[PDB]
Design a protein around this ligand. Structure first.
Ligand SMILES: *[C@@H]1O[C@H](CO[C@@H]2O[C@@H](C)[C@@H](O)[C@@H](O)[C@@H]2O)[C@@H](O[C@@H]2O[C@H](CO)[C@@H](O)[C@H](O)[C@H]2NC(C)=O)[C@H](O)[C@H]1NC(C)=O
Ligand SMILES: *[C@@H]1O[C@H](CO[C@@H]2O[C@@H](C)[C@@H](O)[C@@H](O)[C@@H]2O)[C@@H](O[C@@H]2O[C@H](CO)[C@@H](O)[C@H](O)[C@H]2NC(C)=O)[C@H](O)[C@H]1NC(C)=O
Ligand SMILES: CC(=O)N[C@@H]1[C@@H](O)[C@H](O)[C@@H](CO)O[C@H]1O
Ligand SMILES: CCN(CC)/C(C)=N/[P@](C)(=O)OC
Ligand SMILES: CCN(CC)/C(C)=N/[P@](C)(=O)OC
Lengths: 527, 531
């Protein structure tokens, strides 16, 4: 046997697998159980630690994906299938994965922990684009990723109730981080150098562990890619969370919270998924049914309030966005949009799209959005309207929440590094009009262009190696440098552009637009 | 004995004029023609009565008195301010007009330009050196008329509903002057069927209110509005606010010692004119710039609705208008109350002074509205740069009070049948005494329209004399034909939004009268104040 693939953790023994990369072998331990399967009576309940096992757990292949909706907008299209589950769906899905150099490190190695995105309703650590083999070989870190419950199974909340308290998907992540603290040294990892990174809802999850004290002691640095806990989509209030959970029960034939949750636990998992989207209050894009709830427990206040009231001295954070955060979501409900044509919409379609992209706001608020995003010298140009409503969705949901997080963190003691990812992949399968869409920096952070079986250019392989160096440098030292990448400050607002060209320093993360979302709109909605 | 060309008979009687020298030749001037009975004593605040006929010959040989008004003392002796102050004695006996005609008098009917001065409805006079009509008449061979109208409380104090002080009598003064033109301008060689109103600031606002009042609409055919509109936030006032200001002015002068309107007005009528003027500014609701105490009141009479509503609902086919602004409409007004501002230093204000100035420049709006102003006019990459903040507050005041009101008027008129031409005046006069940071301030295109640079005693450059002659040609071409052209000046439309720049260079066509900023003032901000 290969002694390098045998590991004993607190719960028992594991057998791993040796993987190949163009730069040499790596050790992988896939499908390690870290929680008891949240089946039957454990549905909706907080996770509990996996009990010890005898024998050797086979950790050579990925485990099941947590039960989730499957996208059917473009069947067979790679641009959407790459995010769909690539393993069997199951509620028995609380497993994590460890990648480590081969042979395993003998001295403590910095740890990167990946939290996937997918709007709190989808995602899996087994997706090809999250393959940790290249980061580990190239930068000699330990990479851990976990699966956490999504959809109703992870975030259905009847606030106050104990049968369905909410946020258990976040607790799945916290349990995995506790598992890392207790077991990563057995793989060569340093439990005192843990860097969280995630994208979208994963980035939102990273930020929520930053604002929940029981999680704060489980890591030391944070990376937030195209997401933040303080957006309009990553949290929901107790009242609306209760309305959605109650509505879901009605749609599946269920009836007192105890009796309500009791009935929901009798339904097949696929039945809950089939009605998940129908509990949203209106037509929308960039909105998801079951998300973290602000109930005073995991989050003792709104993330915005927790960000403004925090002392963040001693914290290093890496945040950033892609060039066109909004484009991807427009084909999921904005009238006039799809991947198949130029999406050259009209004024009427733009105005209708604003109510879809900014749902659940007063008409006056919507008019304010139209004022700020209309070019009143070209109020009806279709190309400008397409770009503008992409800006509306992208700034409202990603860029401006990320800009607000960065500004307040920097102004309250944290050292912040900000980027804008501006390279359109040569292999990109979405249309040109989408630009650099949400989620298409990940494959470069994970070094997927180094895979010889794929068709990335030579330049793109070099660019991926740069990005892996920045990310790993930040994990080791809190700084990606060593042309310089300067810290982001609330005044200078400096960031860098990441593309095939060398680093270029710029000012302002859509500062004009984000003054509207972050400073003026909250005042308007309050009056 | 007598010169037959300086003798004219109008309906009221005979007149005697004078022969004026101009650099281009002689011009006949009939200055100080009475067109109303003096609104003295019992007639204070009352509508004007037509001048009763007279026997003998009235000497119309010099400008008459300036209507009683506040005299500005901000920079005593400074040319930039003294040029707007009265250059004749103050008197309530001030309802006189002036006619300039070519020498010899026209053989055939000649198009008429009628000037309405500005001054915030509280000041002004047709006798100001900058309104001298001799150069226009000589250069372009039109007849030019200008009238005095009552300003301040004497022209616009309103107790709505009462007949002792109904309000808007200053506008009735101009209407009577326009009526006089219809009945008498032919005696000077003028064509009563080709009459073009033009005015600046409150004079431009007055021109617009004649457009929206049917009884005046039949007295002229074309309109020119310079740096002013009837629909701005300063040109009109509501019935209740007009009565509150009128009642408080009376209270401040011992009247009564509110109540019955007749006794209130009769008490006001006993007060010396200067006593009313001394308290005029104290009735304003708050500290502000670009706000004036006694302005036209929307009472359903002269204006059956707000100028906004009358504009949006009006049919303007068959009308030609010429509208425009100068490059820096807001700067002049900042030194009148915005913190940090002076003509004598660079006025490089702080962020705190900028936020304070927003409330002074946009008075009587909710805190949310003020926050919306700060959002649009702040550069969030340079939120505290003093120079940028200075230009920003100038824009706030200029867009809110002039540019966007003019832009809305232009767009609605064009969309509803009118033919409109728009300009932006971009030349800073070589003789300008205001500091450089003010740019091209409000009011300083008038001297070029009137051909003042042709005066030998002044020191404009030769280029400026050509520039003035070209501007006079545009204005007269519009008066004669409804088209300033003959490089072209295209009409203004709500879509293309084309206008020309007026400076020493040839005409350049551009798009949008501050389209982004005025979308905020004209489209969004009203929706916010309604909620
Ligand atoms: C661009 O495409 C959209 C999407 O339409 C779908 O995809 C196209 C490639 C084609 O297969 C269409 O027939 C599909 O419906 C068009 O928006 C739709 O237009 C039709 C009427 O033409 C309407 O019934 C649908 O409801 C529209 N979809 C939405 C979400 O509003 C759009 O018209 C196309 N633009 C063009 C052709 O210029
Ligand atoms: C620019 O000038 C203003 C106006 O102040 C007047 O003009 C100055 C040139 C100088 O002669 C002052 O003494 C005059 O009072 C300055 O603002 C004033 O500042 C003083 C004290 O600092 C204050 O009492 C006044 O209220 C201010 N006036 C207003 C209208 O706010 C301003 O400070 C000058 N800017 C500089 C010097 O940078
Ligand atoms: C309603 C009212 O009382 N108005 C009166 C008016 O009728 C009267 O004529 C005048 C004094 O003569 O005082 C006032
Ligand atoms: C994995 C990236 N994707 C799919 C495109 C998403 C949706 N991330 P996030 O949850 O966006 C709200
Ligand atoms: C005559 C031009 N002036 C003086 C600068 C004014 C104030 N015109 P208008 O009344 O401006 C609101």
């Amino acid at each position: 046997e290969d002694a390098e693939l045998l590991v004993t953790v607190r719960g028992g023994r594991l057998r791993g697998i040796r993987l190949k990369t163009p730069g040499g072998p790596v050790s992988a331990f896939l499908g390690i159980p870290f929680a008891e399967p949240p089946m039957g009576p454990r549905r909706f309940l907080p996770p509990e630690p996996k009990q010890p096992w005898s024998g050797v757990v086979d950790a050579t292949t990925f485990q099941s994906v947590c039960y989730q909706y499957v996208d059917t907008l473009y069947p067979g299209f790679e641009g959407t299938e790459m995010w769909n589950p690539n393993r069997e769906l199951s509620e028995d899905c609380l497993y994590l994965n460890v990648w480590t150099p081969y042979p395993r490190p003998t001295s403590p190695t910095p740890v990167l922990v990946w939290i996937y995105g997918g709007g709190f309703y989808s995602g899996a650590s087994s997706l090809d684009v999250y393959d940790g083999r290249f980061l580990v070989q190239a930068e000699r870190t330990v990479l851990v990723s976990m699966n956490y419950r999504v959809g109703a199974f992870g975030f259905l909340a009847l606030p106050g109730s104990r049968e369905a308290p909410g946020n258990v998907g976040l607790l799945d992540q916290r349990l995995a981080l506790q598992w890392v603290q207790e077991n990563v040294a057995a793989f060569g990892g340093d439990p005192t150098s843990v860097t969280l990174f995630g994208e979208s809802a994963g980035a939102a999850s990273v930020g929520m562990h930053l604002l929940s004290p029981p999680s704060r002691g489980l890591f030391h640095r944070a990376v937030l890619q195209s997401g933040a806990p303080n957006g309009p989509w990553a949290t929901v209030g107790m009242g609306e969370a209760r309305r959605r959970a109650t509505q879901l029960a009605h749609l599946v034939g269920c009836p007192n919270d105890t009796e309500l949750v009791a009935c929901l636990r009798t339904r097949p998992a696929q039945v809950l998924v089939n009605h998940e989207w129908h509990v949203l209050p209106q037509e929308s894009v960039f909105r998801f049914s079951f998300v973290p709830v602000v109930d005073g427990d995991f989050l003792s206040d709104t993330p915005e309030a927790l960000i403004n009231a925090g002392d963040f001295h001693g914290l290093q954070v890496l945040v950033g966005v892609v060039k066109d955060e909004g484009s991807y979501f427009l084909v999921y409900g904005a009238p006039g949009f799809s991947k198949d044509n130029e999406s050259l919409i009209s004024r009427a379609e733009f105005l209708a799209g604003v109510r879809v992209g900014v749902p659940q706001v007063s008409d006056l608020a919507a008019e304010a959005v139209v004022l700020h995003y209309t070019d009143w010298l070209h109020p009806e140009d279709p190309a400008r309207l397409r770009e503008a409503l992409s800006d509306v969705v992208g700034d409202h949901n990603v860029v401006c929440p990320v800009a607000q997080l960065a500004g307040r963190l920097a102004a309250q003691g944290a050292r912040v590094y900000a980027y804008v990812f501006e390279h359109r992949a040569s292999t990109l399968s979405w249309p040109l009009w989408m630009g650099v869409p949400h989620g298409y920096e990940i494959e470069f952070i994970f070094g997927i262009p180094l895979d010889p079986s794929r068709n990335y250019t030579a330049e793109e392989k070099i660019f991926a190696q740069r990005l892996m160096r920045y990310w790993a440098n930040f994990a080791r030292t809190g700084d990606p440098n060593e042309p310089q990448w300067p810290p982001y400050t609330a005044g200078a607002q400096q960031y860098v552009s990441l593309d095939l060209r060398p680093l270029e320093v710029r000012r302002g993360l859509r500062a004009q637009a984000c003054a509207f979302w972050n400073r003026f709109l909250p005042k308007l909605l309050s009056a």
